[PDB]
Amino acid sequence: ATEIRASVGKMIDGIGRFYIQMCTELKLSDYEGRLIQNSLTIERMVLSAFDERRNKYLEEHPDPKKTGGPIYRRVDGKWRRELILYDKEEIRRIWRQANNGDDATAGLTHMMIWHSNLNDATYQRTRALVRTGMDPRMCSLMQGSTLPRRSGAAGAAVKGVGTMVMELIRMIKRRTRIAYERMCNILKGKFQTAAQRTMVDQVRESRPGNAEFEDLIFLARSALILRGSVAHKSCLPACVYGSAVASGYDFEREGYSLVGIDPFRLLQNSQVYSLIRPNENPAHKSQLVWMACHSAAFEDLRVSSFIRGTKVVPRGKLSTRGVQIASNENMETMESSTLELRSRYWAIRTRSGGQISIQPTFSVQRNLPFDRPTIMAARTEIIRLMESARPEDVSFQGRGVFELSDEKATSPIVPSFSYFFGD
Amino acid sequence: ATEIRASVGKMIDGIGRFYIQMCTELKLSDYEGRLIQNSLTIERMVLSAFKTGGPIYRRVDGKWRRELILYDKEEIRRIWRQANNGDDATAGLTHMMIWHSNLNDATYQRTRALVRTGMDPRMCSLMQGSTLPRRSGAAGAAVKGVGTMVMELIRMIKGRRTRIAYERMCNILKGKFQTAAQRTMVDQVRESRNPGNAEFEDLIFLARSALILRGSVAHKSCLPACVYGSAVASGYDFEREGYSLVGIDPFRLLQNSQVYSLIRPNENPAHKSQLVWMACHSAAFEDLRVSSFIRGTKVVPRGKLSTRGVQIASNENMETMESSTLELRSRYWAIRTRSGGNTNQQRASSGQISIQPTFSVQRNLPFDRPTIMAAFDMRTEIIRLMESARPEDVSFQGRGVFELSDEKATSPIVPSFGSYFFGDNAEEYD
Amino acid sequence: ATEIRASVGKMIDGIGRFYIQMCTELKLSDYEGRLIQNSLTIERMVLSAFKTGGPIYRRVDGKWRRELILYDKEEIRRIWRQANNGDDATAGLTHMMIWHSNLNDATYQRTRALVRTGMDPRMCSLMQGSTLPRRSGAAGAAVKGVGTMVMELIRMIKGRRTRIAYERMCNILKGKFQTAAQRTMVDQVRESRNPGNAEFEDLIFLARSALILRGSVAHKSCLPACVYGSAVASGYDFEREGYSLVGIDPFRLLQNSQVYSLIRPNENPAHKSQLVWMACHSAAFEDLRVSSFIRGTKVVPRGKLSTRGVQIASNENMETMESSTLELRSRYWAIRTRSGGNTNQQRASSGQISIQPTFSVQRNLPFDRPTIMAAFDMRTEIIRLMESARPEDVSFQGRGVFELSDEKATSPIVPSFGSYFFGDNAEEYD
Numbered sequence A: 001a002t003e004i005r006a007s008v009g010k011m012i013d014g015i016g017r018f019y020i021q022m023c024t025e026l027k028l029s030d031y032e033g034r035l036i037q038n039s040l041t042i043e044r045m046v047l048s049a050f051d052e053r054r055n056k057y058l059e060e061h062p063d064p065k066k067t068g069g070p071i072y073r074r075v076d077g078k079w080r081r082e083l084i085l086y087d088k089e090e091i092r093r094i095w096r097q098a099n100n101g102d103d104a105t106a107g108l109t110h111m112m113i114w115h116s117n118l119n120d121a122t123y124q125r126t127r128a129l130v131r132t133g134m135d136p137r138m139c140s141l142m143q144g145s146t147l148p149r150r151s152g153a154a155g156a157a158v159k160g161v162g163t164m165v166m167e168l169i170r171m172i173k174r175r176t177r178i179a180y181e182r183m184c185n186i187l188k189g190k191f192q193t194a195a196q197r198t199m200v201d202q203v204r205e206s207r208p209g210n211a212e213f214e215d216l217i218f219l220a221r222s223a224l225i226l227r228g229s230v231a232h233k234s235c236l237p238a239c240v241y242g243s244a245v246a247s248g249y250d251f252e253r254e255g256y257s258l259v260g261i262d263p264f265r266l267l268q269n270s271q272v273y274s275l276i277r278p279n280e281n282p283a284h285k286s287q288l289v290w291m292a293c294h295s296a297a298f299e300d301l302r303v304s305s306f307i308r309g310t311k312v313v314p315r316g317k318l319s320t321r322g323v324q325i326a327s328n329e330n331m332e333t334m335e336s337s338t339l340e341l342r343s344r345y346w347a348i349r350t351r352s353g354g355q356i357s358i359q360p361t362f363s364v365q366r367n368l369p370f371d372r373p374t375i376m377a378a379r380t381e382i383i384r385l386m387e388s389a390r391p392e393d394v395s396f397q398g399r400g401v402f403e404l405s406d407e408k409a410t411s412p413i414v415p416s417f418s419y420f421f422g423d
Numbered sequence B, C: 001a002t003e004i005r006a007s008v009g010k011m012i013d014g015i016g017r018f019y020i021q022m023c024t025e026l027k028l029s030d031y032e033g034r035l036i037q038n039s040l041t042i043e044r045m046v047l048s049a050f051k052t053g054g055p056i057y058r059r060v061d062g063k064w065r066r067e068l069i070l071y072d073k074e075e076i077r078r079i080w081r082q083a084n085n086g087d088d089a090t091a092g093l094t095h096m097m098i099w100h101s102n103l104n105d106a107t108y109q110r111t112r113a114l115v116r117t118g119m120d121p122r123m124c125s126l127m128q129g130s131t132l133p134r135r136s137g138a139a140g141a142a143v144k145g146v147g148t149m150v151m152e153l154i155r156m157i158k159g160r161r162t163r164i165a166y167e168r169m170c171n172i173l174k175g176k177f178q179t180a181a182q183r184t185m186v187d188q189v190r191e192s193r194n195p196g197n198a199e200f201e202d203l204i205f206l207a208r209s210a211l212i213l214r215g216s217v218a219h220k221s222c223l224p225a226c227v228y229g230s231a232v233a234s235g236y237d238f239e240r241e242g243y244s245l246v247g248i249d250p251f252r253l254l255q256n257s258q259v260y261s262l263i264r265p266n267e268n269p270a271h272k273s274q275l276v277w278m279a280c281h282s283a284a285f286e287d288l289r290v291s292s293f294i295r296g297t298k299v300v301p302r303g304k305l306s307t308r309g310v311q312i313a314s315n316e317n318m319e320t321m322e323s324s325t326l327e328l329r330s331r332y333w334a335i336r337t338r339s340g341g342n343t344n345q346q347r348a349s350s351g352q353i354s355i356q357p358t359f360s361v362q363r364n365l366p367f368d369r370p371t372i373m374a375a376f377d378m379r380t381e382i383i384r385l386m387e388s389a390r391p392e393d394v395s396f397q398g399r400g401v402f403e404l405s406d407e408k409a410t411s412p413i414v415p416s417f418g419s420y421f422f423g424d425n426a427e428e429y430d
């Protein structure tokens, strides 16, 4: 729909306008405005100013009116770091004015999903997994685990199965009954098999101990094979949108999507910068940000490499640390470098997780192939299903990548043939 | 060095300010201002001013539209001076001229101009700055190839200010030749009263010699004004940082720049990119091997490029025009040279031009025929000198390409090895 | 065009009828009649008639048997005339001769014949139709290469009907040369009274010139009689459809034909196929690059072919002979030309023969040495003309190959590029 495309374009324009004004207030250069470290701080300032939970607390426990973070300028051939303090009310004022008077929570949530996609690409969260009571190897089900509980509509769709499992277990271990039933429906709406979905209803209609806890732990384990419906959104740093709005792109009129070609197109026409530590490889910094930009942290490295063009190395062999720079780090040795965020191909982001056999005619040495899942499928059932599926079963049949010039999904390109957090 | 960087950084800063000022006057978006076609028209207007106009392209209602607006030359002349802190600033003007010249050198073969002058059309590589006007700047004089100089001199041969202009050009050409013998011939052309056919025949001889005993011709990375303007707008100070046309600066600038181009239906945007990349680094007549190595992707001959010229004529319809990012970046960088390579010295040789059979095995027995047979007044001295030279001889010893992070050129990469851009045509397969 | 197609279609139709008639007389099966060895003997008999015989091969009891039968020349002569609707039909006879000539041109190097005539044995490419008799047909005269003509003329030099035959041959040779200078030399050889050593030395000079300033020699796709006979039998009317030796017709005929050959123990049937394919399209002295491209598979040099001649001598035993399909089809087709390529005009040049260094990088600096150095009565005029020519120069501009469904040659494919068939031997690696 043009309307869905226009309303999505409305919020990006809103982010864009806000970032522009924010950059002029801080008197940042266009290059400095496009430094991702500044973008993060600026993005962090808005979210802090609308953090109602924190703001209510600070009124109750008395500078609470001001919010800050590190900002980076190039002064006398060197990168300087500075802590800037800015009034929260004015930040909210700028946000509203940029979003045409509205408090647009969708735009804020959009910047939260971006930070979440960045965290998943940067850090493995094993410490949180063990403390809750689940396997540290369940990390591929942990998309959106750094997001808040009441995060909004888009935030709910982005969250993984294990994320929902962790949130529920923490409640079971601990008005709020309505939230428990609401969160169960979110979890249930992501399981594709009827066997998994029915098990959720048992854990939902209960007033919960070991048995319910063990159900969620089992249901999470099953999601490693019988995967859930997790939405994937391309959410870019605010500087990307700010720069495009500044250069004359109208996201409202042109429309926009987060699962289409649009973000790939935009990054092809973007130049984002990052600060780099003495012994870091810029190509690996670029890989990290690229993966975050498209929510590809838990993706197969081969399909990510095919889309990207260059090799997508796993995290353990990646010669870089996080994008953010700690307060104790020496700025005298900091250099700025371009982030290569382009791609050779593009592909649609998924919310998902004739002849069937062959009759031999010739007497030759070969395997005799057959589509097993379609032929064969014609608590107990969960184990029965998990045993059936094979690592070499094909999914998304017929679907492929596209050339950048192919604006519509006309001619797909199917590749011929993997863990980012591998041992 | 610091002083050269200062003045160079000053003129680019001027071109920058002018372009920003020019982009606001026309109410162009940032993207539109960074369309190469818009940049070329703006560059044209200020050169034509020293009424003026040309095509300006906008993105109207999802489609590219063409409008040819006009400006008073006086108003443009005022804008240029005032963007260049008062000064008339002729240097920045010839800088935009050399950029146009480099683009012409990459786009068009000028064989029709060569035959009229009685010159061999296979002298491409001698023709840098041939579309550049006679009596250009000093920067224009340095950039002009031997053949350009020869051509301009023949047009003279074919009011005694004609005499000094003839002698200045002889001196410009003389300063480019790297052997004494070639220089002595130019003196003989210069010292001549009432120049005619003898001097014409001498100049053609000198041009042929310059294909083997190559002359010193300057090479300057000169970019479209939008690249400079975009940099100034975004917070780069060329006066504080300085600038160089032959060092790393232009390579680094392009790496931090994004330029667009209008593309025709049957055109490959990568091939359009190669052409403008070549133009940007004055690389039309370079070895394709070295251009390819530096760029990181193959630099293909002119005849195998699915692209026409950058400019779009008023004849063709805009309804089918689309826009594309120009890929103008590089894997490595390399210093732009004034040198034509080794021409003399002949300090020994050191090499192997034949084999001695060790094994009783059937095969041919290779040897370098032209070199071995070669050993068996100022005109014949040149002949003997260019007969000694071999295509195999290595110039620029010890020099190499550099990583884009190697700002000070500390660590040269020497490459281990399709050479002629204008070699692949319907008449010749070179 | 229609008239040429009519008469050509008539003679092939005649050869066809003759072969069918000849195949019934010998009680050969269709397969056996389409064995190339059987076709060659039948073709031989009718040429020898104008007693005659030769080997005829049959499939007896699971094995190939050889029998040499005889026929009265008068009876064969009667069969030929009566298959050609009364007429003596000499044209169809020289057509079978040119086919034999083309096969000989592909099979044998005739260096022993060249040395006796005082000619350089490296003149292969000049020797089309050398095994063709002196005083062949007009079609035979057109097909003969420059070297063949030179060789035949020297044999004359080494009863005043000798005078006119000498002058006819000088005119045949003159009509083949494409430059005035070469033609003027032939006049000087012709106008000579009592020809001797001066004319011999002139003819060798003219032959050498024809390796660079190539002459106009005709090329005609001439197929074994079984191909024509098989087509007539199967319902093709060459008189109604017409026929062409230089257009698409023979390529299309071969595509709808299946010919067989006897193969020796150590022979590769694909290599046997290449040889007969080359012969069929008069391609012995073509560039292997163009032959390969047209055929669709690699056309390998003579010395790398694991095959002997097509004919099987009476010496060798039949017990080890097997039979194989000859692959005579093609990926594309192309018009057979009379032209020797560009020899003059010299309208400019347009190209690049050197580079100008842009980057300070270590490398050799390529240049076209022979071309650059080249610029530094009728005999020397030829020397100067062939000194100007380059191996790189492109002939047949705008012309290309065609798909087999492109009957009218509407859409030429120009190819983007091992050249000499007789280049790979024990004495030379060309």
Ligand SMILES: COc1ccccc1-c1noc(C)c1C(=O)N1CCN(c2ccc([N+](=O)[O-])cc2Cl)CC1
Binding pocket: A244, A248, A249, A250, A254, A256, A261, A262, A263, A265, A266, A269, B031, B032, B034, B035, B059, B260, B261, B323, B324, B325
């Ligand atoms: C079709 O061009 C335009 C289209 C729209 C606006 C300006 C131009 C334009 N005006 O001048 C030039 C030059 C232009 C150009 O070619 N651009 C700029 C915009 N680009 C882009 C494309 C898609 C997305 N997205 O998010 O889907 C984001 C972006 Cl930034 C594509 C490249």
Ligand SMILES: COc1ccccc1-c1noc(C)c1C(=O)N1CCN(c2ccc([N+](=O)[O-])cc2Cl)CC1
Binding pocket: A029, A031, A032, A033, A034, A035, A074, A273, A274, A336, A337, A338, B231, B235, B236, B237, B248, B249, B250, B252, B253, B256
């Ligand atoms: C050290 O960075 C800076 C350095 C100077 C100014 C701004 C920045 C800067 N401020 O914010 C970010 C982000 C920046 C950045 O990283 N840049 C911008 C300038 N760049 C550049 C480098 C060299 C040439 N030249 O022509 O030699 C041209 C250019 Cl455009 C290099 C990349």
